[PDB]
Design a protein around this ligand. Structure first.
Ligand SMILES: OC[C@H]1O[C@H](O[C@H]2[C@H](O)[C@@H](O)[C@@H](O)O[C@@H]2CO)[C@H](O)[C@@H](O)[C@@H]1O
Length: 469
């Protein structure tokens, strides 16, 4: 149901989608192929849901960390550029889009967070995180604040969590150990404790989000923010004179941002794969194509060598790359989505006071390190739960799940057992989806045997996890 003879492109709303649309208009004039750029609200999650049914955009843009999961799910076409084209982009950017030996997207640009500071409020910005409480107290006396940044997305807190030792999945001997997670080690706990202490002491508010922090910095209300290159053009438009610099150190160690490569994947369901390749290789990944996007919202350090030679002269790009070199390339492994979910929960719960730092990170550690087992829990839920109950009992469960899963009346009537299994596991990660069905079915007498077996399947998996760990 993707239309043949047209290109639909999805890219996140913080990127230069109007510039990308200009590249699309040029393509349409040359080829007669309409190009429509959209930026739907929850892109990285709408795509895997609609693409799994054969729908969605021809081309999907996101940082490379989500792409290995998309590839494992059969959502992406293999990328096979000629050697001459491969030579046009930096090898480490191709590495970010290589998964299981094959290229699964075109790399576009390299993103890392930097410290952005107001040069008039703060000519000499702090070198350490530890200086920020005293700096905030100074600025509060002048009706200003020291620092505001998005606390709702763990991407922005990760550099501080990683500074003294936190890590996602351990990398050694050229491979990631998806069972060695570094979310609850001493360094991670120290970094998140520092952040939570900033909030407890009223140097930041737990509810600060992207929009609040951007407006506060761009209006001159806060002296510093933490953001990526896409944010610079809105600061240019503002009255604020800003610098982009190395992130503060923590316990004398650099902040370690997770480095993202904005990447463009081709939907395996697209009937326009040849046109998508033409657009990406010969329109976007040219000096003129990247310039059109970059002039809208800066891309960062682009993957195209010819254009990066120009951008590298910008001290904001030098600062981006200095922070990138102190950080780490994100894994692209399929477990990244579950890792980010677990860490998002931990940061939000610790910052808001719903959990201590220790308990929040302990749970995130467990959740991320058991993410490998998510497919097996889903299989148990589908094969030993839903497929073993008649339509009547399935409908009753759908009724009980409707509030939490957002099921309308039509959805309750039409959704099959596979769709419900998928929705449940997204809402109740891993083992929680199986616990949920047990909880709902425990008091239906005709499902007594079904529930008994679900409990044994649940223990059986926990045993295999306890054996393999
Ligand atoms: O916060 C978790 C989130 O982090 C990264 O998302 C970044 C993205 O890479 C940036 O380009 C920009 O859009 O900010 C996002 C954070 O809000 C990961 O790429 C993403 O998968 C993950 O969920």
């Amino acid at each position: 149901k993707i239309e043949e003879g047209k290109l639909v492109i999805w890219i996140n709303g913080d990127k230069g989608y109007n510039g990308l649309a200009e590249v699309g208009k040029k393509f349409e004039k040359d080829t007669g192929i309409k190009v429509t750029v959209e930026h739907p609200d929850k892109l990285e999650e709408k795509f895997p849901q609609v693409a799994a049914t054969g729908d969605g955009p021809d081309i999907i843009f996101w940082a490379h960390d989500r792409f290995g999961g998309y590839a494992q799910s059969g959502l992406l076409a293999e990328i096979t550029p000629a050697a001459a084209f491969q030579d046009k982009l930096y090898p480490f950017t191709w590495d970010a889009v290589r998964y299981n030996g094959k290229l699964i997207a075109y790399p576009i640009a390299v993103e890392a967070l930097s410290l952005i500071y107001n040069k008039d409020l703060l000519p000499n910005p702090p070198k350490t995180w530890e200086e920020i409480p005293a700096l905030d107290k100074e600025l509060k006396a002048k009706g200003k604040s020291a620092l505001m940044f998005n606390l709702q997305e763990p991407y922005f807190t990760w550099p501080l969590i990683a500074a003294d030792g936190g890590y996602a999945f351990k990398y050694a001997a050229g491979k990631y150990d998806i069972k060695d997670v570094g979310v609850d080690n001493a360094g991670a706990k120290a970094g998140l404790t520092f952040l939570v202490d900033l909030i407890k002491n009223k140097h930041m508010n737990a509810d600060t989000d992207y929009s609040i922090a951007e407006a506060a910095f761009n209006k001159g209300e806060t002296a510093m923010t933490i953001n990526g290159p896409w944010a610079w053009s809105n600061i240019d438009t503002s009255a604020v004179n800003y610098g982009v610099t190395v992130l503060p150190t923590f316990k004398g160690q650099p902040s370690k941002p997770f480095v993202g490569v904005l990447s463009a994947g081709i939907n395996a369901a697209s009937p326009n794969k040849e046109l998508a390749k033409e657009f990406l290789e010969n329109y976007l990944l040219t000096d003129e194509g990247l310039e059109a996007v970059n002039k809208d919202k800066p891309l960062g350090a682009v993957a195209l060598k010819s254009y990066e030679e120009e951008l590298a002269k910008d001290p904001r790009i030098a600062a981006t790359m200095e922070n990138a070199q102190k950080g780490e390339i994100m894994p692209n492994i399929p477990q990244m989505s579950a890792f980010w979910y677990a860490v998002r929960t931990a940061v939000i719960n610790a910052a808001s006071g719903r959990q201590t730092v220790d308990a929040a990170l302990a749970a995130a550690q467990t959740n991320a390190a058991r993410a490998f087992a998510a497919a097996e829990y889903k299989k148990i839920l589908l094969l030993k739960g839903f497929e073993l109950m008649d339509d009547y009992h399935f409908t009753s469960i759908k009724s009980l799940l409707a509030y939490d899963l957002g099921l309308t009346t039509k959805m309750q009537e039409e959704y099959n057992r596979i769709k419900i299994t998928d929705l449940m596991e997204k809402k109740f990660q891993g083992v929680a989806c199986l616990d949920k069905l047990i909880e709902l079915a425990k008091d239906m007498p005709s499902l007594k045997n079904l529930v008994n077996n679900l409990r044994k399947e649940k223990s059986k998996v926990a045993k295999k996890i306890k054996t393999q760990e």
